[PDB]
Design a protein around this ligand. Sequence first.
Ligand SMILES: CC/C(=C(/CC)c1ccc(O)cc1)c1ccc(O)cc1
Ligand SMILES: CC/C(=C(/CC)c1ccc(O)cc1)c1ccc(O)cc1
Lengths: 115, 115, 115, 115
Amino acid sequence: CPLMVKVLDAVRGSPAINVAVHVFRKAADDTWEPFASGKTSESGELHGLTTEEEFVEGIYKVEIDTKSYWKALGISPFHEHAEVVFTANDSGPRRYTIAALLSPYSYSTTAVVTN
Amino acid sequence: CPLMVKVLDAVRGSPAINVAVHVFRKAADDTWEPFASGKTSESGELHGLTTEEEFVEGIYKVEIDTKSYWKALGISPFHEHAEVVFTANDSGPRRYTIAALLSPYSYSTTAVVTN
Amino acid sequence: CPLMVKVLDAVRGSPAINVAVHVFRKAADDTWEPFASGKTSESGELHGLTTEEEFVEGIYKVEIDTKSYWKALGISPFHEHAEVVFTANDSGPRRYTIAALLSPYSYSTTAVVTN
Amino acid sequence: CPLMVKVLDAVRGSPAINVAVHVFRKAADDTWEPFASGKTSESGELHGLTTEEEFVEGIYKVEIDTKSYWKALGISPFHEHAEVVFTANDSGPRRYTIAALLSPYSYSTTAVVTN
Ligand SMILES: CC/C(=C(/CC)c1ccc(O)cc1)c1ccc(O)cc1
Ligand SMILES: CC/C(=C(/CC)c1ccc(O)cc1)c1ccc(O)cc1
C-alpha cells in the first residue's frame, strides 16, 4: 500500500467516514487521467487504492469529496472538494500517507512520505 | 474587492511574499478558464483580483503556486500547488477571503465570507 | 502595537467575534502573571494589548477562550481554551501576530513576526 | 489505551520522533498535577500514557515539547510547546487521540474521541 488517505472531521472529533476519494494522474497530453478511487472506512482511512507496480512516477491529484461529505451530514460547506497535487516516486518508490482534516469552511492537509 | 487571497509561511513565520496565484472559473464544458491572477504583496496579500461586476456566481478554482515559492527559498516542497475550489453564491453582500498557511509538506486553508 | 491576536472561525467561515483573550508573562517563580487581555473585535482582531515599552523579552502565554465562544454559538466544544506559549526575543524591530483558526475539536495557530 | 498522542512534522513530511509529552491533570486546588509523560516512537505515536482506571474525569493538559524537538533538529522555533487542554470522561470513559502537526512557527491539533 504505497498510497493511503486518512480523513478526520474537526466538527465532530471523529474519523470522516464514507468520504469519496478520486485519484488522477497527469497524462502525456497534460490532462488528468483517472487513476484510482475509493471511500474511507469507519476509521477514516482508505487503503488499497493502488499497488507498487501501478503507482509509477508521475504527478498525481488526490481529490477528497468534502462537499458530498458535509451535505450528507445536512451541512452546506464552502469547498467543492479538497485537492492534494504532488509529484510521486521521482526518486524511487515511496509510501505516501495523505491526511486531511475537515471543517465546513476550512481544510488542512499534510503528507507523510516514508521509504 | 469581492475576492482576496492571503498567504502566510509557517516555516519562517512571515507573510508568503511574491507567491503566484491563479484564479479560474468553471466553464459550461467543465473546463477551467483563466479568470484572474497576481502575486502576493509584501504583506502576503493579493487584492484587486476582480470586481463585483465580474465576480458572478459560479465555481472557482484558486491555485497558489507553493512549489515555486519554496524553491525560491531553497526549501524542498511536496505539493505542486495549493488548490481551493468553491462555489460563489449570492447571499446578500459578501466578500470572500481565501487564506492559506504554507509548510513544505502541508497546507491549511480557510474561507472568510463577510458582509 | 508589538502584539496582535487574530481569530477566525472554521465552521461559520467568519471572524471569531467577542472572543476573550488573556495574555500572561512568566514570572521569576515560574508562575504566570496577568499581562494584558481583551476581546476580539468584529474583524476577529484584538489590538492595543500592549506597548513597545511594556513588551519586554520574556516568556508569554496567550490564552484564547474558545470554549465560551463555542458555547455562545450553541456548538459543543472539545478544548477548554487555546494556548500559545512563546518567548519574545529582541531581534531588530518586530511585531508579533498570533493567528488562530478555530473548529470545535481542533485549532491551528501560527505566528507572523515582521519588521 | 484511553489516551494516545500522535505528532507529525510538516517540514520533513514524517512522524515527529522522540518528542517529549507531559500530561497534567487539574487538582482540587486548581493547580496542574503531573499525570503521565512519555516520548513519541518512530511512528510519531505515544501509547500507554495511562489506563482506564487511572484516567478519571477531570481537566487535562497535554503539553507537547515542540521547542526541544525543533532544537534537536538544529532549528530555532517560535513556540515553547504545544498545549491541548480539555475536560475528559465527563459523560463516561472515552478514548482520546490527540494529534498535532508541527512547523517551526505554527502548530495544529485535533482530537478524535471514540466510545
Ligand atoms: C486563522 C486563519 C488565517 C490563517 C492564515 C492564512 C490560517 C489558515 C489556516 C490555518 O490552519 C491557520 C491559520 C488568517 C486569516 C486571515 C488573516 O488576515 C490572517 C490569518
Ligand atoms: C497530525 C496530522 C494528522 C491530522 C489529522 C488529519 C492533521 C492534519 C492536518 C492538520 O493541520 C492537523 C492535523 C493525523 C495524521 C495521522 C493520523 O492517524 C491522525 C491525524
